[PDB]
Amino acid sequence: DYKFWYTQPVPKINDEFNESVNEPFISDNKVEDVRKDEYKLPPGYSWYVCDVKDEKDRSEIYTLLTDNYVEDDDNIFRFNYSAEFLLWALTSPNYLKTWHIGVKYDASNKLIGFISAIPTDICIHKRTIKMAEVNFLCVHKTLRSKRLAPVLIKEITRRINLENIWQAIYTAGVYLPKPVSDARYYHRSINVKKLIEIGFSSLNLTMSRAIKLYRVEDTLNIKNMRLMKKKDVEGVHKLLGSYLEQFNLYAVFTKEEIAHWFLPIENVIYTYVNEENGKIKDMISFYSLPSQILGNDKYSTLNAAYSFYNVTTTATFKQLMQDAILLAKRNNFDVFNALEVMQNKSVFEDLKFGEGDESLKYYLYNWKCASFAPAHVGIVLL
Ligand SMILES: C#CCCCCCCCCCCCC(=O)SCCNC(=O)CCNC(=O)[C@H](O)C(C)(C)COP(=O)(O)OP(=O)(O)OC[C@H]1O[C@@H](n2cnc3c(N)ncnc32)[C@H](O)[C@@H]1OP(=O)(O)O
Ligand SMILES: [Cl-]
């Protein structure tokens, strides 16, 4: 039915546009006309201003998401973003505190809903648009299917429009009207035995053969790959910024955004560079996103690395991503996850990735344009 979404400026399920269409559904919007009142909540609920730089507010967000956020289709793993990860994800350059929106139940003073956005410049089919990047929509499990999600979406839309921003980018595992692209997840086992025992992976292929199949030589193809430092920011900016221009959808990073999104933070973000004759010629990056293991008496956490942005000019992309796997292994990750975006799909078979069973759909709000294969996607959202 899509009874909420069809009231919104998004494509209808049957909409199809060719390359000559690349523009808003609704243009000529006016800040002075935006609703100035918060949207009404059901009785006993209230909007809450989450200060993610406040330890208590940030821990309430963490707890809400730890207990209630995204689970896999088989309900065995739930994402477990850390408090430090949330800080990094939500306080990117020029972030707005008004875009970190909580809902509390007054009687218990408990956070039961959350939605967030950060500002980012998005190039879609070579047009660069100031957008809001919406993430972490969460409604407490006990309150599902009470139509709270539309109210959260409408309220953050209002707050984004008050900054004279009228487009948004978001991803979801569920199908909504209507993806601009759709990218399957793929998974490269690192700690084989653990993945088998938690039912992430399967045997048939004995235990010892599986361990041998996925073994990793502890030698880099690019021997001087090293952790990124502050002096590397301009070089990473130039290397990644030039690389991303080939894609139909990417973020246009400023130097300040490069510093924020790529300077290493232990157990949050890992970036490695290859410096040659002064110049950053290759880079590898992946972020940490563990999953809670629901109902396993031996293991409580899956330590997963997620491919972020990877560029090579002195090796093949397979060689580069082989080093990415090694580096994730060296930092104690159990599995290395990646989407079939950018050049990634070309190395999945040779590097012994397995196809997952879920995909990530890319969405734009108030924008109509042609869809495209995920190899043309040049952005990875958290
Ligand atoms: C300009 C500016 C624009 C700014 C706004 C742009 C639009 C942003 C849309 C949201 C983007 C989300 C990005 C993500 O962060 S991804 C992660 C999704 N997080 C989870 O998976 C956590 C686990 N899960 C939950 O916490 C809840 O299930 C949710 C996701 C809150 C859903 O709430 P529940 O209580 O089920 O559903 P209710 O409150 O009755 O609302 C029904 C309507 O809602 C739609 N919907 C459902 N899931 C959605 C979802 N994930 N994103 C958007 N919409 C969603 C759904 O179709 C339906 O509407 P219809 O009637 O079908 O038109
Ligand atoms: Cl080495």
Numbering used by the authors: 27 to 230, 233 to 410
What sentences appear in the manuscript?
The attachment of myristate to the N-terminal glycine of certain proteins is largely a co-translational modification catalyzed by N-myristoyltransferase (NMT), and involved in protein membrane-localization. Using coenzyme A (CoA)-activated lipid, NMT transfers myristate to the substrate protein, after removal of the initiator methionine, in a predominantly co-translational process (Ritzefeld et al., 2017, Schlott et al., 2018). Pathogen NMT is a validated therapeutic target in numerous infectious diseases including malaria. PvNMT possesses 80% sequence identity and 93% similarity to PfNMT and is an excellent platform for structural studies, while to date PfNMT has proven intractable for X-ray crystallography.
The current study describes identification and validation of the consequence of a single amino acid substitution (G386E) in the substrate-binding pocket of Plasmodium NMT, identified by drug selection of a non-synonymous point mutation in the nmt open reading frame. In contrast to G386, E386 places a large, charged side chain in direct proximity to the nearby Y211 residue. Interestingly, the nearby His213 displays a larger degree of flexibility in the PvNMT[WT] structure, modeled as two possible rotamers (H213a, H213b), whereas the residue adopts a single conformation in the G386E variant (H213a). A preferred conformation (rotamer Y211a) was adopted in both the unliganded PvNMT[WT] and [G386E] enzymes, and, on binding of DDD85646 to PvNMT[WT], Y211 moved only slightly to rotamer Y211b when DDD85646 was bound to PvNMT[G386E]. We found, depending on the inhibitor bound (IMP-1002, DDD85646 or in the apo form), that E386 can adopt up to four distinct occupancies showing its flexible nature. Even though G386E reduces the space in the peptide-binding pocket, the flexibility of Y211, E386, and H213 provides a plausible explanation for why substrate myristoylation is unaffected, leading to no reduction in fitness or change in global myristoylation. There was very little difference in labeling pattern, and therefore no detectable effect of the G386E substitution on global myristoylation, while continuous culture of the two PfNMT[G386E] clones revealed no significant growth defect over six generations as assessed by relative parasitemia, normalized to the WT population. These data provide evidence that enzyme function is not compromised in the G386E variant.
